[PDB]
Write an enzyme that holds these catalytic residues in place. Sequence first.
Site, PDB file in Angstrom:
ATOM      1  N   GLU A   1       0.886  -1.159   0.000  1.00  0.00           N
ATOM      2  CA  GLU A   1       0.000   0.000   0.000  1.00  0.00           C
ATOM      3  C   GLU A   1       0.927   1.212   0.000  1.00  0.00           C
ATOM      4  O   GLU A   1       0.540   2.314   0.375  1.00  0.00           O
ATOM      5  CB  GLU A   1      -0.926   0.016   1.219  1.00  0.00           C
ATOM      6  CG  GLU A   1      -0.253  -0.046   2.577  1.00  0.00           C
ATOM      7  CD  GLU A   1      -1.255   0.156   3.705  1.00  0.00           C
ATOM      8  OE1 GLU A   1      -1.914   1.219   3.728  1.00  0.00           O
ATOM      9  OE2 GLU A   1      -1.394  -0.740   4.561  1.00  0.00           O
TER      10      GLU A   1
ATOM     11  N   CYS B   1      -3.321  -3.321   4.607  1.00  0.00           N
ATOM     12  CA  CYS B   1      -2.255  -4.186   5.078  1.00  0.00           C
ATOM     13  C   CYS B   1      -2.606  -5.666   4.903  1.00  0.00           C
ATOM     14  O   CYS B   1      -1.997  -6.531   5.518  1.00  0.00           O
ATOM     15  CB  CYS B   1      -1.919  -3.849   6.540  1.00  0.00           C
ATOM     16  SG  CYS B   1      -3.311  -3.260   7.558  1.00  0.00           S
TER      17      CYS B   1
ATOM     18  N   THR C   1       4.386   4.392  15.800  1.00  0.00           N
ATOM     19  CA  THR C   1       3.996   3.090  15.269  1.00  0.00           C
ATOM     20  C   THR C   1       4.592   2.851  13.879  1.00  0.00           C
ATOM     21  O   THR C   1       4.276   1.859  13.221  1.00  0.00           O
ATOM     22  CB  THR C   1       2.460   2.970  15.186  1.00  0.00           C
ATOM     23  OG1 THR C   1       1.967   3.858  14.179  1.00  0.00           O
ATOM     24  CG2 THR C   1       1.816   3.351  16.515  1.00  0.00           C
TER      25      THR C   1
ATOM     26  N   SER D   1     -10.337   2.933  13.779  1.00  0.00           N
ATOM     27  CA  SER D   1      -9.294   1.979  13.427  1.00  0.00           C
ATOM     28  C   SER D   1      -9.196   0.944  14.547  1.00  0.00           C
ATOM     29  O   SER D   1      -9.215  -0.270  14.311  1.00  0.00           O
ATOM     30  CB  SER D   1      -7.961   2.717  13.260  1.00  0.00           C
ATOM     31  OG  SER D   1      -6.875   1.815  13.145  1.00  0.00           O
TER      32      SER D   1
ATOM     33  N   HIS E   1      -1.725  -9.532  12.630  1.00  0.00           N
ATOM     34  CA  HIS E   1      -1.249  -8.357  11.920  1.00  0.00           C
ATOM     35  C   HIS E   1      -1.334  -7.375  13.079  1.00  0.00           C
ATOM     36  O   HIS E   1      -2.289  -7.423  13.847  1.00  0.00           O
ATOM     37  CB  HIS E   1      -2.237  -7.853  10.873  1.00  0.00           C
ATOM     38  CG  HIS E   1      -2.088  -6.391  10.592  1.00  0.00           C
ATOM     39  ND1 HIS E   1      -1.065  -5.884   9.827  1.00  0.00           N
ATOM     40  CD2 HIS E   1      -2.765  -5.316  11.073  1.00  0.00           C
ATOM     41  CE1 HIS E   1      -1.110  -4.562   9.846  1.00  0.00           C
ATOM     42  NE2 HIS E   1      -2.134  -4.196  10.598  1.00  0.00           N
TER      43      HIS E   1
ATOM     44  N   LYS F   1      -4.780  -6.387  22.896  1.00  0.00           N
ATOM     45  CA  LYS F   1      -6.122  -5.939  23.267  1.00  0.00           C
ATOM     46  C   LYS F   1      -7.174  -6.755  22.504  1.00  0.00           C
ATOM     47  O   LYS F   1      -8.212  -7.118  23.059  1.00  0.00           O
ATOM     48  CB  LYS F   1      -6.292  -4.444  22.956  1.00  0.00           C
ATOM     49  CG  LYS F   1      -7.594  -3.832  23.490  1.00  0.00           C
ATOM     50  CD  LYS F   1      -7.706  -2.326  23.173  1.00  0.00           C
ATOM     51  CE  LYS F   1      -8.966  -1.714  23.799  1.00  0.00           C
ATOM     52  NZ  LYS F   1      -9.230  -0.329  23.316  1.00  0.00           N
TER      53      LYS F   1
ATOM     54  N   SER G   1      -6.796  -2.702   6.561  1.00  0.00           N
ATOM     55  CA  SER G   1      -7.614  -1.516   6.766  1.00  0.00           C
ATOM     56  C   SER G   1      -8.478  -1.404   5.516  1.00  0.00           C
ATOM     57  O   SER G   1      -8.114  -1.938   4.465  1.00  0.00           O
ATOM     58  CB  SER G   1      -6.723  -0.277   6.909  1.00  0.00           C
ATOM     59  OG  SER G   1      -5.799  -0.186   5.837  1.00  0.00           O
TER      60      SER G   1
END
Lengths: 383, 383
Positions: free
Chosen positions: A79, A111, A152, A201, A233, A242, A308
Amino acid sequence: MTIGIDKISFFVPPYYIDMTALAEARNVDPGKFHIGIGQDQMAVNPISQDIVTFAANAAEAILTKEDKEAIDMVIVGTESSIDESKAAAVVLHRLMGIQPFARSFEIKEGCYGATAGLQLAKNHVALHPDKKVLVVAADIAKYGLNSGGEPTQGAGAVAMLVASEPRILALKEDNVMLTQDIYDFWRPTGHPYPMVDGPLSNETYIQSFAQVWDEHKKRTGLDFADYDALAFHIPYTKMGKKALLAKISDQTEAEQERILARYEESIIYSRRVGNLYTGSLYLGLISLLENATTLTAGNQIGLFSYGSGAVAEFFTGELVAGYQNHLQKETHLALLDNRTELSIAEYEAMFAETLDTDIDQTLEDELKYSISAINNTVRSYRN
Amino acid sequence: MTIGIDKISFFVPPYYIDMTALAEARNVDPGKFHIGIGQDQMAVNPISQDIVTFAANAAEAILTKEDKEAIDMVIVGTESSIDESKAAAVVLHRLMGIQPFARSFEIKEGCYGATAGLQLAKNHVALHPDKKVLVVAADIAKYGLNSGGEPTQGAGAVAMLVASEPRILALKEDNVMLTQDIYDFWRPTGHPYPMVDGPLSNETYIQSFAQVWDEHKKRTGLDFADYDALAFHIPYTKMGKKALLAKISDQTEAEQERILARYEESIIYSRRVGNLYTGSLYLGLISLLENATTLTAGNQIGLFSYGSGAVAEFFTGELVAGYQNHLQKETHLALLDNRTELSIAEYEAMFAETLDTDIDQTLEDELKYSISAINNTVRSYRN
């Protein structure tokens, strides 16, 4: 007959910035990134290195002369493309000296692109067992200096050789995919940087895993206890944790402890690299293979690929007997340990640099396959 | 089980310009366009219409309620993307009401992307015979006003439903592919118009056909006499004729006559549309199916797919018994005949208009699936 990943390797640029140093420069607690998002070192690259640079280096680490004659399809998932029409895969096909009668193309879907490539490559090989496919995840995750996403960031590539009788991971036919039109992360044509809806997101990633996991459980009856390990991922480590935590809450304490320990093992390399977009899930797979000492032949690895946009897929792979003898642990540790640590000043200078493809010029870089020149917008690579 | 195209349809914008009118406005002999490159009418679209608009309209023509439940993969082949990250296939998946558990993504490789999608779709259905795959070629070929490539422009989409036991074209396992790193046509990130090396493009296309055809003949023993018709990707109708003429030079003057007349039938729709990039080859296939009166079930169709960059593939398809009952001729004729002719002035005004995606706005256009609004760079479509 089995089909899957025969060889796999990753490449990251020869530079990085320590997260304590970044936190200091950003006037926030020195340990904010280490315990918050869970990142320690961030891969950084100069403008003389692009997805072709990374893809070519990652792929070179695993291709033999025989492989090059047997591969009849080259797929690049990304991407971070450098052309709107010509697939980066065509350039990769040339640099790798792969035989000419091959199909080459780029796949794009956040991704998730490289995962699509791996699945289609698997089908191809299932139908033509004597042929192999080269699938490479390549991306540069840049958000901008002093931006919310900055910590990130990452850059690199993961190359995979798909073939019959794979020596590392045999892929199962238990795929569960999901498509939902959601604007969590996107990048309008001509935006050097992505558009990000933080809350969305975060929510979509977590709920994507849950949706795909649930459907997969319904179709197969397989639960967390049936998985020896899970690769995710991840935009950053805390995120996958999480997503995982929210779904394993009803598991026994021992099981939760076991699943989280494997997860910690899967992110060992990621903590020293950052987000690889299409290559993140696969970097986690590599980390698991080279760092998880309790895994053995026959074990089941669940892989959650997130894209995404958004598109997600859960699928399983079985460790092949002897796989431990076909990894690249040493090459990989060398790659990470041999990087030059940048000062925040050096980093900001390198990150701010921009390649004006419209300007004819030459570039100096010692890395093999880095951009050597630009002529009438066309890139040359030193090899 | 046979596998291939079950249904197919094309869609072009509701506007066009006469090539005579363009020639006169460009101070060129009308014959240089009508006979030189072989084009008569050029498809033109306003900024309120993008590849999603065309892909959605094309796919809707062939999708039933059952199809939408059986489709678990949506692929868009394009080189006119509107996002660097989010695949256009994701939006198409939503607008078409396809079941959620599907994988969606974009394939990029010049005008070859759709072909790659078709082949991978074929493999998928071969392995999962109860499932279907939606593959859509969608592109907008704009070179610029007063540009060298201007007269070869076009715009539109071609949607194909791939399934086992196809009702139109059963694909053969005789694919011959080729990849060569050649800069004939490309488009650096940020370039609204293509970079073109006309003569290299011309020669690379002619030579690529020869190479895959020769290699195919070497592997199958099949020659021109064994083909009832041929569909070619074409930047313009004289280019394919030129490639064909160069390769049939040693056939009997009667074969030659048959091959060339059959080629004439394959470009009838194309002369009224112009280059569709990923969709050019497939528009020729539709034209053959809907305009070639003497073709029948059992007949062998040869397809040559070319992708700038460059990649190529020659493969065969067989007409399925009853195919004449699953076409969309009436719909296509209405689409072509009902278009509004634009004067050159209306064309230039429409052509030059840009869409500032950075501006929140509302757009007007009667066409279903045209862009209705832009909010924070996000496009909404009229449905």
